[PDB]
Amino acid sequence: NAMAEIKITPEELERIAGNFKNAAGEAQSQINRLEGDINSLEGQWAGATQAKFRGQFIQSKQAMQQYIPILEGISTDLKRIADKFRNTDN
Amino acid sequence: SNAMAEIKITPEELERIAGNFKNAAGEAQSQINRLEGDINSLEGQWAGATQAKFRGQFIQSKQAMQQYIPILEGISTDLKRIADKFRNTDNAY
């Protein structure tokens, strides 16, 4: 019985939409903290070394800036279908 | 502390920062894995264009993470390698 498929409802779509929204927030927090670390290395070693690590970090930030809006788009699509369900029932 | 004035960070401090990057890489992978489970739990109940829309968006997000994760891994690995380089002139003389 515990393996019964959980049927889609607006509540389920909103729960999962929330998971994606929360994931976007955690990702942002993570990139912020990592940026702080790279910032902390400035002046702590050779300028050439810092340039290499800043460069790598910005490439990671760019990847994250593609990723976050994709999660938010999924969250939006789930919520739009959730709304469709609620309005049909009304 | 290093023999060289220009090096103001210890190997242990670089290793600490490298751990933050390794932890972030692990957390990112765990996150996309949980979200994949969410997408998987719905997939069989969608059909046609809607099913494809969610599958495609999820695939895009996974590919973005396939970019992001190895960059964090590279930063962590490289930080540690530099820690090892610096160690030879840290508290040595």
Query: Could you count the other beta carbons within 10 Å of the beta carbon of residue B20?
Result: 18
Do residues A44 and B38 make contact, with C-beta atoms less than 8 angstroms apart?
A: no
Residues 6+ apart with CB under 8 A from B3: B89, B90, B92, B93
The coordinates were experimentally obtained by X-ray
DSSP state of B6: T
The residues with which B90 forms a beta bridge, in sequence order, are B2
Residues 6+ apart with CB under 8 A from B1: B10, B90, B91
Alpha helices in chain B (DSSP H): 11-43, 48-87
- Measured between beta carbons, the chain A residues lying within 8 angstroms of B68 are 60, 63-64, 67
Nearest Cα to A20, choosing from B66, B51, B35? B35
CATH of the domain at A66: 1.10.287.850
Q: How far apart are CA A44 and CA A50, in angstroms?
A: 8
When divided into structural domains, chain B yields a total of 1
Q: How far apart are CA A41 and CA B81, in angstroms?
A: 15
In which domain, by residue range, is A37 found? 1-90
Expressed in Å, this structure's resolution amounts to 1.7
Q: How far apart are CA A29 and CA A47, in angstroms?
A: 27
Q: How far apart are CA B73 and CA B35, in angstroms?
A: 21
The residues with which B2 forms a beta bridge, in sequence order, are B90
Q: How far apart are CA A6 and CA B41, in angstroms?
A: 8
A60 contacts B7? CB cut-off 8 A: no
Nearest 5 degrees, angle CA A12-CA A17-CA A19?
A: 100
DSSP state of A80: H
Could you tell me which residues of chain B have a Cβ less than 8 Å from any Cβ in chain A? 6-9, 17, 20-21, 24, 27-28, 31, 34-35, 38, 41-42, 44-45, 50, 53-54, 57-58, 60-61, 64-65, 67-68, 71-72, 74-75, 78-79, 82
Q: How far apart are CA A19 and CA B32, in angstroms?
A: 11
Q: How far apart are CA A79 and CA A73, in angstroms?
A: 10
Nearest Cα to B2, choosing from A9, A83, A49? A49
Backbone angles phi, psi at B14, to 5 degrees: -65, -40
